[PDB]
């Protein structure tokens, strides 16, 4: 039972936020944690832990490569670079329940740090 | 460097497999894990390692909710659900580079449990 009742107010709030059917054009963005911030401010809307979290690793994922340095929006197109963030964000406003994030949470020491403000009216 | 032969031969491989543009359609299905077999098997190609198993994961946020057994095209609909996993897939035919995977490889001792079989021509 630790972390339930933070983790069910969050849960219950995001699931409430309605993923915007009106779309902007293009973002230029050049990690994917550079470009949901493009769509948080654009938008107004905050995105959840669990798409925060899994666009750090996106990111992450590409240390390493033998490539030279190219920008993310030459390989992914901001079209659907967009799409994306806003589909894994949907599945993660309806689908886990808030004793998944509770779990995860007990285990990640930093899970706030993926968890964004409040946004203005 | 150990891991670094095979998850470069797989990288390599995955990269090269084209993202299908002709759709069929609705596929009804009851997880993601469920959704992406029904995929693989019509369209007859494999999916990532990183699309596994976050499609694992997904599915395994759902449990320990209060609601009642709901089907999960229920919440996702089969269109924009379909649709994520060949965005989801994308990110990860292009990004990640060998390294990476290695490195995953190395602290997941079940690894080659999320990497799919060879597929028919
Ligand atoms: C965002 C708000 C309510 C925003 C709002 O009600 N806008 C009204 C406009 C009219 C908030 C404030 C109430 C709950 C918070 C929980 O206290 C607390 C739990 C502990 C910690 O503090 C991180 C705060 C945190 C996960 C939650 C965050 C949740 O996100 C709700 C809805
Ligand atoms: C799928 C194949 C080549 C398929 C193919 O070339 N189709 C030709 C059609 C004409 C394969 C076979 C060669 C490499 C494999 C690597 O040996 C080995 C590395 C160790 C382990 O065994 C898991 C096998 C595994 C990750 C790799 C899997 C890679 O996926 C390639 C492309």
Same mark, same amino acid.
């Given at each position: 039972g630790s972390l339930l009742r933070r983790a069910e107010m969050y849960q219950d709030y995001m699931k409430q936020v309605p993923i915007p059917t009106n779309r902007g054009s293009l973002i230029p963005f050049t990690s994917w944690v550079g470009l949901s911030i493009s769509m948080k401010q654009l938008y107004g809307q905050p995105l959840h832990y669990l798409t925060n979290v899994l666009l750090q690793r996106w990111d992450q994922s590409?240390?390493?490569?033998? *490539?030279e340095e190219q920008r993310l929006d030459s390989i992914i197109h901001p079209t659907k670079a967009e799409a994306t963030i806003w589909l894994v964000e949907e599945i993660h406003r309806l689908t886990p329940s808030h004793l998944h994030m509770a779990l995860l949470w007990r285990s990640?020491?930093?899970?706030? *740090?993926f968890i964004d403000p409040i946004f203005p009216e």
């Amino acid at each position: 039972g630790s972390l339930l009742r933070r983790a069910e107010m969050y849960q219950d709030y995001m699931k409430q936020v309605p993923i915007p059917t009106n779309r902007g054009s293009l973002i230029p963005f050049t990690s994917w944690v550079g470009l949901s911030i493009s769509m948080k401010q654009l938008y107004g809307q905050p995105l959840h832990y669990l798409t925060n979290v899994l666009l750090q690793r996106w990111d992450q994922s590409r240390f390493g490569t033998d *490539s030279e340095e190219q920008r993310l929006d030459s390989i992914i197109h901001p079209t659907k670079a967009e799409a994306t963030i806003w589909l894994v964000e949907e599945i993660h406003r309806l689908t886990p329940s808030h004793l998944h994030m509770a779990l995860l949470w007990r285990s990640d020491p930093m899970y706030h *740090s993926f968890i964004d403000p409040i946004f203005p009216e």
